[PDB]
Amino acid sequence: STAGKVIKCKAAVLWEVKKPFSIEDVEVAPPKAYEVRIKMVAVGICRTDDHVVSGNLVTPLPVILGHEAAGIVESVGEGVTTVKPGDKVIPLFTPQCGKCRVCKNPESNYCLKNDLGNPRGTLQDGTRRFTCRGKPIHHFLGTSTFSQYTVVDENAVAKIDAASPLEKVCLIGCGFSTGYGSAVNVAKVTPGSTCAVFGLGGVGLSAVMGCKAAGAARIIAVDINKDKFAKAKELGATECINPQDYKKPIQEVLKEMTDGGVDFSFEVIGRLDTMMASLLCCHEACGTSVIVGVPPASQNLSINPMLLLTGRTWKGAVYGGFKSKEGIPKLVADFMAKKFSLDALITHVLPFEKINEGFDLLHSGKSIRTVLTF
Amino acid sequence: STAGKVIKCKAAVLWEVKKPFSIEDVEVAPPKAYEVRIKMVAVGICRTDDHVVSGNLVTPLPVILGHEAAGIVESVGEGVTTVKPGDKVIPLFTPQCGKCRVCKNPESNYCLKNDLGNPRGTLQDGTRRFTCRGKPIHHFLGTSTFSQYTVVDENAVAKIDAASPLEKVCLIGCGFSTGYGSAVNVAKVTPGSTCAVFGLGGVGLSAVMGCKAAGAARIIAVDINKDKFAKAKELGATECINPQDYKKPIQEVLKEMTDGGVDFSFEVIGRLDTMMASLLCCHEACGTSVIVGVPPASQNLSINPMLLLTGRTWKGAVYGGFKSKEGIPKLVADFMAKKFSLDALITHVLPFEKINEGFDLLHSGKSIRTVLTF
Ligand SMILES: [N]C(=O)C1=[C][N+]([C]2O[C]([C]OP(=O)([O-])OP([O])(=O)O[C][C]3O[C](N4[C]=NC5=C4N=[C]N=C5[N])[C]([O])[C]3[O])[C]([O])[C]2[O])=[C][C]=C1N1=[C]C(I)=[C][N]1
Ligand SMILES: NC(=O)c1ccc[n+]([C@@H]2O[C@H](COP(=O)([O-])OP(=O)(O)OC[C@H]3O[C@@H](n4cnc5c(N)ncnc54)[C@H](O)[C@@H]3O)[C@@H](O)[C@H]2O)c1
Ligand SMILES: [Cl-]
Ligand SMILES: [Zn+2]
Ligand SMILES: [Zn+2]
Ligand SMILES: [Zn+2]
Ligand SMILES: [Zn+2]
């Protein structure tokens, strides 16, 4: 019925920054060659989506955000070999074209086909598939999952287990993968090591889970919102610190707690002051600091190079180091194999139409993750 | 015989910053427990020594500098078990106490008994062994080799091959180990990779050799002194470029020549602008920039954290990641086995008394490594 036909549906369109989303009628064009048109089922709210709402992450507007989600293949374009209609899928905010220098490198995952470096708000072919009131609307990270239907490039979609509960598994689309992989793939936490995690939201907590799985002996959870400590400990944090209870700077408080500093620290928030704190609290001779939080546009850090000369390793990564099209699937399988659980991360489930309410909860600090359902 | 007695000898004293070295008679107190008094045979002139003179590295004056050396054990204090009088040895600017958190950690080498963090200008017990006209003289990195005799802690001296040519293996005491290990140990250069080395002094040329040993496919040597190019080439560089020949920033050139950037970048000069260019020239998603150059005191770098989120790795190291006491002897054995040659690095040989002429050669850019004989 719908195949090859333009689908009219509802989607949350952002026309301006610091404005609410508009649940409007938009026309979703049919998938071109090597493209897949997905029917969304569950979409989780990531702070990155909010970054555009706040102006911290610039991207052409009007836009349809969303990138953390799960859905079903409504139809595919010509040349599509990986997914067929009906297949359960997870759109990847970072592609794996498999042909660029990066994709060919065994330890890189930031494919050259991404729309993060220099945002165009289009699909890999430079064009858009969304329209609304005679106006073309921009995509976001080539996923735009805040819509009942969306078109994505084949190399940016991954087929998952047919029995996968799309309402939970949508987190593996971003939050869980990013945090967990940051600990296991990027930092490469060693068994018996000491770790520190700044920020305890959806991504932060999965970093706790990742350090735990890696065998970290001590995991120090850091957050100004005390309410997150309950979950942090439950997921594996050995202790919880709130920077506000101290008269002393956090990195100092941390170094005196761990005999000179932690082995691995992760900044999962997105502030310069906290990224400075994470670099400073990891032992000057053998510590590794992993930046996970997305920094506000055009801001810099002033660092003394002596901080690295002694032996510190400072790195960062997108998507927790997982090569998208391969990693996400295998992750779902592990979830199926009951290797881990995403239940503690989902605190609120709202109907798509109340997306604006979902962003409110994120700003009030009442929710870890909120899953908008279709 | 001089054991147990105060030795009187010549040493090069720096009384004030930015002033020539003054060759004076000093008294060298005999060694205490776990200390070794050494008779110097050959010393190399490293830019770090010059960093104190110029004022870029702060350390208490007046002082006896020098740290890349080779000599013979004159006598040992009570408790010493790792060396005996007559042994050929290399003092280590960074000790390997073997009992601290860092020494236990198999991946870090920056021992806690170092005098680089906050220089006391003493031995490990907190005292000095040099006197000059009543005035006690400060030590440097616990080694102070610009003297005919010096005393070092036992954990800062490595016993080497009895047949080692001391006028050659002194480079292994610092310059070579640092350069070669930065590539092989710290960056862990992968075979078939592309490398950029900024700075072609004795340390930077050892970084080049190390990249070649690692099997890099390309090694681009950068330096504003074209007279260094002939040696870089001979040592492994596939190409050499002079930033002054270009219209655009060196980082943009390097990225254009290597399909987006190198895989491994090395800053071996000690300047802020080059450490930045060095980070910027390694591929945003898979590059590793390694800081080897000692930056001028209290100077800060201003960086956009986004530069790291894409996948870049930024780190630094001392002594090229080698655990001093263990690594030096092994490296001397490799030298003995012809595994590598030091001849190209050693461009000048002058008697100790001509030390000022040696620093002048460095300043003019006419030398790579100048060795001083006693
Ligand atoms: N880390 C460690 O361990 C170390 C370090 N360090 C450092 O390094 C550097 C360098 O050294 P050297 O090699 O000796 O020096 P020289 O000879 O002077 O060389 C330099 C080079 O560079 C070049 N440049 C300049 N500028 C520039 C350039 N290029 C380009 N661009 C620019 N701008 C010149 O020409 C020459 O050639 C320094 O910094 C030092 O410091 C060393 C060693 C080691 N250590 C540490 C220690 I406490 C002691 N030692
Ligand atoms: N690299 C990536 O792949 C990637 C992926 C997804 C998200 N992110 C980024 O990760 C970061 C967090 O994502 P999330 O969705 O889990 O966010 P979130 O907003 O729900 O959680 C941020 C947490 O940090 C805490 N916090 C805020 N200011 C703090 C401070 N100054 N000190 C200590 N804690 C503070 C908040 O209480 C909250 O618990 C954001 O920057 C997001 O853009 C990065
Ligand atoms: Cl268009
Ligand atoms: Zn790719
Ligand atoms: Zn996300
Ligand atoms: Zn040196
Ligand atoms: Zn030690």
Swiss-Prot record, chains A, B:
<dbReference type="InterPro" id="IPR013149">
    <property type="entry name" value="ADH-like_C"/>
</dbReference>
<dbReference type="GO" id="GO:0004022">
    <property type="term" value="F:alcohol dehydrogenase (NAD+) activity"/>
</dbReference>
<dbReference type="GO" id="GO:0036064">
    <property type="term" value="C:ciliary basal body"/>
</dbReference>
<keyword id="KW-0862">Zinc</keyword>
<dbReference type="GO" id="GO:0004745">
    <property type="term" value="F:all-trans-retinol dehydrogenase (NAD+) activity"/>
</dbReference>
<feature type="binding site">
    <location>
        <position position="111"/>
    </location>
    <ligand>
        <name>Zn(2+) 2</name>
    </ligand>
</feature>
<feature type="modified residue" description="N-acetylserine">
    <location>
        <position position="1"/>
    </location>
</feature>
<feature type="binding site">
    <location>
        <position position="174"/>
    </location>
    <ligand>
        <name>Zn(2+) 1</name>
    </ligand>
</feature>
<feature type="binding site">
    <location>
        <position position="223"/>
    </location>
    <ligand>
        <name>NAD(+)</name>
    </ligand>
</feature>
<feature type="binding site">
    <location>
        <position position="67"/>
    </location>
    <ligand>
        <name>Zn(2+) 1</name>
    </ligand>
</feature>
<feature type="modified residue" description="Phosphoserine">
    <location>
        <position position="22"/>
    </location>
</feature>
<keyword id="KW-0007">Acetylation</keyword>
<feature type="binding site">
    <location>
        <position position="97"/>
    </location>
    <ligand>
        <name>Zn(2+) 2</name>
    </ligand>
</feature>
<keyword id="KW-0963">Cytoplasm</keyword>
<comment type="subunit">
    <text>Dimer of identical or non-identical chains of three types; alpha, beta and gamma.</text>
</comment>
<comment type="similarity">
    <text>Belongs to the zinc-containing alcohol dehydrogenase family.</text>
</comment>
<dbReference type="GO" id="GO:0008270">
    <property type="term" value="F:zinc ion binding"/>
</dbReference>
<dbReference type="GO" id="GO:0005929">
    <property type="term" value="C:cilium"/>
</dbReference>
<keyword id="KW-0597">Phosphoprotein</keyword>
<dbReference type="InterPro" id="IPR020843">
    <property type="entry name" value="PKS_ER"/>
</dbReference>
<dbReference type="GO" id="GO:0001523">
    <property type="term" value="P:retinoid metabolic process"/>
</dbReference>
<keyword id="KW-0560">Oxidoreductase</keyword>
<dbReference type="InterPro" id="IPR002328">
    <property type="entry name" value="ADH_Zn_CS"/>
</dbReference>
<feature type="binding site">
    <location>
        <position position="103"/>
    </location>
    <ligand>
        <name>Zn(2+) 2</name>
    </ligand>
</feature>
<dbReference type="Pfam" id="PF00107">
    <property type="entry name" value="ADH_zinc_N"/>
</dbReference>
<dbReference type="GO" id="GO:0005886">
    <property type="term" value="C:plasma membrane"/>
</dbReference>
<dbReference type="GO" id="GO:0042572">
    <property type="term" value="P:retinol metabolic process"/>
</dbReference>
<feature type="binding site">
    <location>
        <begin position="199"/>
        <end position="204"/>
    </location>
    <ligand>
        <name>NAD(+)</name>
    </ligand>
</feature>
<keyword id="KW-0443">Lipid metabolism</keyword>
<dbReference type="Pfam" id="PF08240">
    <property type="entry name" value="ADH_N"/>
</dbReference>
<keyword id="KW-0520">NAD</keyword>
<dbReference type="InterPro" id="IPR036291">
    <property type="entry name" value="NAD(P)-bd_dom_sf"/>
</dbReference>
<feature type="binding site">
    <location>
        <begin position="292"/>
        <end position="294"/>
    </location>
    <ligand>
        <name>NAD(+)</name>
    </ligand>
</feature>
<feature type="binding site">
    <location>
        <position position="100"/>
    </location>
    <ligand>
        <name>Zn(2+) 2</name>
    </ligand>
</feature>
<feature type="binding site">
    <location>
        <position position="46"/>
    </location>
    <ligand>
        <name>Zn(2+) 1</name>
    </ligand>
</feature>
<feature type="modified residue" description="Phosphotyrosine">
    <location>
        <position position="34"/>
    </location>
</feature>
<dbReference type="GO" id="GO:0005654">
    <property type="term" value="C:nucleoplasm"/>
</dbReference>
<dbReference type="GO" id="GO:0042573">
    <property type="term" value="P:retinoic acid metabolic process"/>
</dbReference>
<dbReference type="InterPro" id="IPR011032">
    <property type="entry name" value="GroES-like_sf"/>
</dbReference>
<dbReference type="GO" id="GO:0005829">
    <property type="term" value="C:cytosol"/>
</dbReference>
<feature type="binding site">
    <location>
        <position position="228"/>
    </location>
    <ligand>
        <name>NAD(+)</name>
    </ligand>
</feature>
<keyword id="KW-0479">Metal-binding</keyword>
